[PDB]
């Protein structure tokens, strides 16, 4: 109930919402059915349209009009946006040459440049190029301001997860909006697009920008707009708010457009019906910029033009049905569409088995257009697991497709031609970013970046301290003329030990053997030097990673590689080595096939042992520096040290061996040398963060040797590939991965074939940012380069996607 018999007189679009049952006059009252009886009459005036016409100029104020062309309108702050063009012979903003904005040019009393976020739903990245002829205002923003070719949304590439990621800098798993549709089993409650439950504040975690601003004394316009408020009215309202007195006027504002998404669903991303919606959005941008010019704010305000995701071609005939796989279809609940999430229909059903559901969905059809996963086995880059609202079972659906439970769900719900929600690396899901204003750079292109980064920058733009978030503060400094945030490197928490030869062979009882008893003064001084770090400048190009937590570990030097060896986890945290373009691959000589050698620098007590691997029928082992890439037959002995050993399922050894034997050489050829850092990852609670030792759920049988959930590598070379990796004078280039350490290759439907047919495809799928690996290992890379730190932070957030060109 609402006592809707009060009035909006003087209160239209009130900035502070009023407490029930007193009727509301804010831009959200419609959505709560709680507007005052006179809201439409007073606040949603439409009379005479939205533009001044020649004859309306210098008219007598008629308050009934939607906007005004009277002489007093400018000081009243309610002229139509084209008033000055028609009545004062001004030019439209789009027709003015653009001119660098070196400093904010603001009216007196403005304490900071305002921020206006112009958000456009379903605005696919390629619209910028493909729609450029019909979007002149947006094209001027783009070419005159700072722009990226595209911006990467978060997974799932749905509306609410992305808008709320924009507002908070958080992954959906952390902010809690993990889909447009959700079930929370602790609340026992459901969230949907239609309905009231989504208004309950308990769904929305973290700290969105409007709250960050408020708490720090910066006033905010309301970010949300009800559908029925026409775009023109949203603009005039923002402009009116900008005419408020200094003490009342907000500093941050948001406009939202339901277009082009709405049309894209109906007609497909490039349907001929899409030209119109794009024209119309441009015209809105035009009204804002004209309105700002009129208020002398066009060289004062920072404007962000930002999308939430793109749009793909998807039709009803491209639907996979779980009824063609599951005979038990009615005992599951499916969240359907461009992604799948599955749980049991009834928790009172003890015959529900996720394991057999997954198996019934694995590689069952030649061209199956979705892949089942347990959520902790999803590519780590999606960061889509650590929330009770995310179901254990997930389907990653191919672009262009849908998953549904039964055929009856589709024909009794072809309507749609476009949808979104797919993997956030998919080109068609990419969206847009432009920044224009005094704080952004002039005529600057920046590389693609992730929308999780924007919260930090919007905080910088407003002089706010951002709440803890998933952006990497400083990684977008190159977007800004000033207001930069100057981060410092995190302090190393643990310093390494540097052990010498401290143990005799006979102290080791590890059940290991090596045919290495096949034994000069010149070449023993030399090999001693190698063990003291003589070649370290070659294999450790960017300094040693810093350990950001409390632990006990050793630096181990070798001819061909350096490692940071954990006495706690009994294996390296990182292994670093450089492979020049000239490097030669060799094989493991027959006599050394099963060779594992004790490391006389490291006690038996802090070593792995071969016996445990012998007893563990499931677990085999591999090496982090690959024997195949040894620089000489004598250096190869080093690669068989028990301290270079890591536990690997035989299924994963196929992947790992192919990476080390074939792919590292290939990358070295193609990139003119590569530096590789590889290591283990333990994330048993799938929170994206390094596990402590008490979180490890699996060990090599009968031992304290913990099993990794993942193995990473970070592969660095020179951006200018005419320079070798080990002599690079400028910017770097990186690709990385976080491969899941799995006892089977079920994820790859082709795995029965040769590794050349499936391994690289699996690796690409599990591409990663260095930053993802930092979270997962507690390490900090690239400590010692000649590059600025901000550039290094950008590099650490880079993701190699393996998609073709936009």
Ligand X SMILES: *[C@@H]1O[C@H](CO)[C@@H](O[C@@H]2O[C@H](CO)[C@@H](O[C@@H]3O[C@H](CO[C@H]4O[C@H](CO)[C@@H](O)[C@H](O[C@H]5O[C@H](CO)[C@@H](O)[C@H](O)[C@@H]5O[C@H]5O[C@H](CO)[C@@H](O)[C@H](O)[C@@H]5O)[C@@H]4O)[C@@H](O)[C@H](O[C@H]4O[C@H](CO)[C@@H](O)[C@H](O)[C@@H]4O[C@H]4O[C@H](CO)[C@@H](O)[C@H](O)[C@@H]4O)[C@@H]3O)[C@H](O)[C@H]2NC(C)=O)[C@H](O)[C@H]1NC(C)=O
Ligand Y SMILES: O=C(c1ccc2[nH]nnc2c1)N1C[C@H]2CN(C(=O)c3cc(OCC(F)(F)F)c4ccccc4n3)C[C@@H]2C1
Which residues are part of the catalytic machinery? 159
From 67, 166, 311, 512, residue interacting with ligand Y (rule: CB under 6 A): 166
- Cβ proximity to Zn ion, 166 vs 288, nearer residue: 166
| 751 binding partner (options Cl ion, Na ion, Zn ion, none; Cβ < 5 to 8 Å by kind) | Na ion
**Is residue 342 within 8 Å of residue 333, measured between CB atoms?**
yes
DSSP code for 496 = P
179 touches Cl ion (CB under 5 A): yes
- Cβ proximity to ligand X, 161 vs 688, nearer residue: 688
- Cβ proximity to ligand X, 181 vs 615, nearer residue: 181
Name which of 710, 717, 658 is nearest 686 in CA terms: 710
From 745, 785, 794, 797, residue interacting with Na ion (rule: CB under 5 A): 745
Strands (E), 627-666: 645-648
From 383, 399, 441, 558, residue interacting with ligand X (rule: CB under 6 A): 383
Q: Is 720 a known ligand-binding residue?
A: no
**Is residue 479 within 8 Å of residue 532, measured between CB atoms?**
no
616 touches K ion (CB under 5 A): yes
Q: Is 591 a known ligand-binding residue?
A: no
Q: How many residues sit in the footprint of Zn ion (CB under 5 A)?
A: 1
Cα(757)–Cα(751) distance, integer angstroms: 8
Tokens linked to 472: 């990497």
Cα(69)–Cα(61) distance, integer angstroms: 8
From 386, 736, 777, 801, residue interacting with ligand X (rule: CB under 6 A): 386
719 touches ligand Y (CB under 6 A): no
**Is residue 768 within 8 Å of residue 800, measured between CB atoms?**
no
| 259 binding partner (options K ion, ligand X, Na ion, none; Cβ < 5 to 8 Å by kind) | none
Residues 173-202 that bind ligand X (CB under 6 A): 173-176
Q: Is 685 a known ligand-binding residue?
A: yes
From 31, 34, 302, 469, residue interacting with ligand X (rule: CB under 6 A): 469
Name which of 594, 767, 575 is nearest 680 in CA terms: 575
| 261 binding partner (options ligand X, K ion, Zn ion, none; Cβ < 5 to 8 Å by kind) | Zn ion
Q: How far is CA 601 from the centre of its chain?
A: 42
Cα(765)–Cα(761) distance, integer angstroms: 6
Q: Is 37 a known ligand-binding residue?
A: no
Residue 697 exposed, middle or buried by CB count within 10 Å (0-12, 13-18, 19+): exposed
Cα(199)–Cα(751) distance, integer angstroms: 47
Q: Minimum distance from CB of 209 to ligand Y (Å)?
A: 8
Length of the chain: 806
- Residue numbers after which the chain is interrupted (C to N above 2.5 A) read 413, 519
Q: Is 689 a known ligand-binding residue?
A: yes
- Please state, as a whole number, how many other Cβ atoms lie within 10 Å of the Cβ of residue 679: 26
From 683, 726, 747, 774, residue interacting with Ca ion (rule: CB under 5 A): 683
Cα(441)–Cα(438) distance, integer angstroms: 8
Residue with tokens 């009824």: 323
Cα(776)–Cα(687) distance, integer angstroms: 9
From 101, 167, 252, 396, residue interacting with ligand Y (rule: CB under 6 A): 167
Question: Per-residue x/- marks for ligand Y, 242-281, CB under 6 A?
Answer: ------------x-x-x--x--------------------
Q: Is 722 a known ligand-binding residue?
A: no
Residues 239-278 that bind Zn ion (CB under 5 A): 261
Q: Is 456 a known ligand-binding residue?
A: no
Residues 190-229 that bind ligand Y (CB under 6 A): 193, 223-225
| Residue 359, C-beta contacts closer than 8 angstroms, at least 6 positions apart | none
Strands (E), 47-127: 115-121
Q: Minimum distance from CB of 165 to ligand Y (Å)?
A: 8
Tokens linked to 499: 């052990």
Residues 140-179 that bind ligand X (CB under 6 A): 170-171, 173-176
| Residue 92, C-beta contacts closer than 8 angstroms, at least 6 positions apart | 82, 85, 286, 290
From residue 717, how far is each of 372, 605, 680, 723 by CA, in Å?
A: 35, 37, 22, 9
612 touches K ion (CB under 5 A): no
Tokens linked to 85: 């063009």
Q: Minimum distance from CB of 503 to ligand X (Å)?
A: 36
Tokens linked to 296: 């002398």
Question: Per-residue x/- marks for ligand X, 327-366, CB under 6 A?
Answer: ----------------------------------------
| 616 binding partner (options Zn ion, K ion, Cl ion, none; Cβ < 5 to 8 Å by kind) | K ion
Q: Is 261 a known ligand-binding residue?
A: yes
Q: Is 772 a known ligand-binding residue?
A: no
- Cβ proximity to Ca ion, 691 vs 774, nearer residue: 691
Residues 721-780 that bind ligand X (CB under 6 A): 775
455 touches ligand Y (CB under 6 A): no
From 180, 494, 603, 620, residue interacting with Cl ion (rule: CB under 5 A): 180
Residue 433's DSSP bridge partners are 306
- Please state, as a whole number, how many other Cβ atoms lie within 10 Å of the Cβ of residue 796: 22
- The alpha helices in 91-241, defined as continuous H runs, are 127-130, 136-144, 159-168, 172-175, 209-215, 231-241
Stretch touching Ca ion by CB under 5 A, among 302-310, 332-340, 435-443, 537-545: 302-310
> CA angle, corner 775, sides to 676 and 578, nearest 5?
10
181 touches Cl ion (CB under 5 A): yes
- Please state, as a whole number, how many other Cβ atoms lie within 10 Å of the Cβ of residue 41: 12
Cα(127)–Cα(136) distance, integer angstroms: 12
Name which of 649, 697, 685 is nearest 776 in CA terms: 685
Stretch touching Ca ion by CB under 5 A, among 38-46, 114-122, 440-448, 501-509: 114-122
Residues 413-442 that bind ligand Y (CB under 6 A): none
| 745 binding partner (options ligand X, Na ion, Zn ion, none; Cβ < 5 to 8 Å by kind) | Na ion
Name which of 379, 409, 381, 416 is nearest 394 in CA terms: 379
The site for Ca ion (CB under 5 A) is made up of 121, 159, 261, 308, 683, 685, 687, 689, 691
Q: Which residues are annotated as a binding site for Zn(2+)?
A: 121, 159, 261, 265, 308-309, 420
The site for Zn ion (CB under 5 A) is made up of 261
The site for K ion (CB under 5 A) is made up of 613, 616, 620
Q: Which residues are annotated as a binding site for Ca(2+)?
A: 683, 685, 687, 689, 691
Q: Which residues are annotated as a binding site?
A: 121, 159, 180, 261, 265, 308-309, 420, 683, 685, 687, 689, 691
The site for ligand Y (CB under 6 A) is made up of 117, 119, 121, 159-160, 163-164, 166-167, 180, 193, 223-225, 254, 256, 258, 261
The site for ligand X (CB under 6 A) is made up of 170-171, 173-176, 205-206, 383, 386-387, 468-470, 688-689, 775
């Amino acid at each position: 109930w609402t006592a809707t018999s009060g009035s909006c007189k003087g209160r239209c679009f009130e900035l502070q919402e009023v407490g029930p049952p007193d009727c509301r006059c804010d831009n959200l009252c419609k959505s709560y059915s709680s507007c005052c009886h006179d809201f439409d009459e007073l606040c949603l005036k439409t009379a005479r349209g939205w533009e001044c016409t020649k004859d309306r100029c210098g008219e007598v104020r008629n308050e009934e009009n939607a906007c005004h062309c009277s002489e007093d309108c400018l000081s009243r702050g309610d002229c139509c946006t084209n008033y000055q063009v028609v009545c004062k012979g001004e030019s439209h903003w789009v027709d003015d040459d653009c001119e660098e904005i070196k400093v904010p040019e603001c009216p007196a009393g403005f304490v900071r440049p305002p921020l206006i976020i112009f958000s456009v739903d379903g605005f696919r990245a390629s619209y910028m190029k493909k729609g450029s002829k019909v979007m002149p205002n947006i094209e001027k923003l783009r070419s005159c301001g700072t722009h990226a070719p595209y911006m990467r949304p978060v997974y799932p590439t749905k509306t609410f997860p992305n808008l709320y990621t924009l507002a908070t800098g958080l992954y959906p798993e952390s902010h809690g909006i993990v889909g447009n549709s959700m079930y929370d089993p602790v609340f026992d409650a459901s969230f949907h697009l239609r309905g009231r439950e989504k208004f309950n504040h308990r769904w929305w975690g973290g700290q969105p920008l409007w709250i960050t601003a408020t708490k720090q004394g910066v006033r905010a316009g309301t970010f949300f707009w009800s559908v029925s408020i026409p775009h023109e009215r949203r603009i005039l309202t923002i402009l009116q708010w900008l005419s408020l007195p200094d003490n009342e006027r907000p500093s941050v504002y948001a406009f939202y457009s339901e277009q082009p998404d709405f049309s894209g669903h109906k007609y497909g991303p490039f349907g001929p019906e899409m030209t119109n919606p794009l024209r119309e959005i441009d015209k809105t941008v035009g009204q804002l910029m004209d309105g700002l010019k009129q208020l002398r704010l066009h060289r004062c305000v920072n404007v962000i033009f930002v999308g939430d995701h793109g749009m793909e071609d998807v039709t009803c005939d491209r639907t996979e049905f779980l009824s063609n796989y599951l005979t038990n279809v009615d005992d599951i609940t499916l969240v359907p569409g461009t992604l799948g999430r599955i749980r049991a229909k009834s928790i009172n059903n003890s015959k529900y088995d996720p394991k057999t559901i997954i198996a019934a969905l694995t590689c069952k059809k030649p061209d199956q257009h979705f892949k089942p996963y347990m959520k902790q086995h999803l590519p780590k880059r999606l960061h889509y697991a650590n929330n009770r609202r995310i179901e254990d079972i997930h389907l990653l659906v191919d672009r262009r497709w849908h998953v549904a439970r039964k055929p009856l769900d589709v024909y009794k719900k072809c309507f749609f031609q476009g949808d979104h929600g797919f993997d956030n690396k998919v080109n068609s899901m990419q969206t847009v970013f432009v920044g224009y204003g005094p704080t952004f750079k002039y005529r600057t292109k920046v590389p693609p970046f992730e929308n999780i980064e924007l919260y930090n920058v919007m905080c910088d733009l407003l002089g706010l301290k951002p709440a803890p978030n998933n952006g990497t503060h400083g990684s977008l400094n190159h977007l800004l003329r000033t207001n930069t945030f100057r981060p410092t490197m995190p302090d190393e928490v643990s310093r390494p030990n540097y052990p010498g030869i401290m143990y005799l062979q006979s102290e080791f009882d590890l059940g290991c053997t090596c045919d290495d008893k096949v034994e000069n003064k010149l070449e023993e001084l030399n090999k001693r030097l190698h063990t003291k770090g003589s070649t370290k400048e070659r294999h450790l190009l960017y300094g040693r990673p810093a350990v950001l937590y409390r632990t006990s570990y050793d630096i181990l030097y070798h001819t061909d590689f350096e490692s940071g060896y954990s006495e706690i986890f009994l294996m390296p945290l990182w292994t670093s080595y450089t492979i020049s373009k000239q490097a030669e691959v060799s094989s493991i000589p027959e006599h050394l096939t099963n060779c594992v050698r004790p490391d006389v620098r490291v006690s038996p007590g802090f070593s792995q042992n071969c016996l445990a691997y012998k007893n563990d029928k499931q677990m085999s082992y591999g090496f982090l520096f690959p024997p195949y890439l040894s620089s000489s037959p004598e250096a190869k002995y080093d690669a068989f040290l028990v301290t270079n050993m890591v536990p690997m399922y035989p299924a994963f050894k196929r992947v790992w061996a192919y990476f080390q034997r074939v792919l590292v050489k290939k990358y070295a050829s193609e990139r003119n040398g590569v530096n590789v850092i590889s290591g283990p990852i333990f994330d048993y609670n799938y929170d994206g963060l390094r596990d402590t030792e008490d979180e490890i759920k699996q060990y090599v049988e009968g031992s304290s040797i913990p099993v990794p959930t993942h193995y990473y590598s970070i592969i660095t070379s020179c951006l200018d590939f005419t320079q070798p990796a080990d002599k690079c004078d400028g910017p770097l280039s990186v690709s990385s991965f976080i491969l899941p350490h799995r006892p089977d290759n079920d994820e790859s439907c082709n795995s029965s074939e040769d590794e050349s047919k499936w391994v690289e495809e699996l690796m690409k799928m599990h591409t990663a940012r260095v930053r993802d690996i930092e979270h997962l290992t507690g390490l900090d890379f690239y400590r010692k380069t000649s590059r600025s730190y901000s550039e290094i932070l950008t590099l650490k957030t880079y993701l190699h996607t393996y998609e073709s060109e936009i």
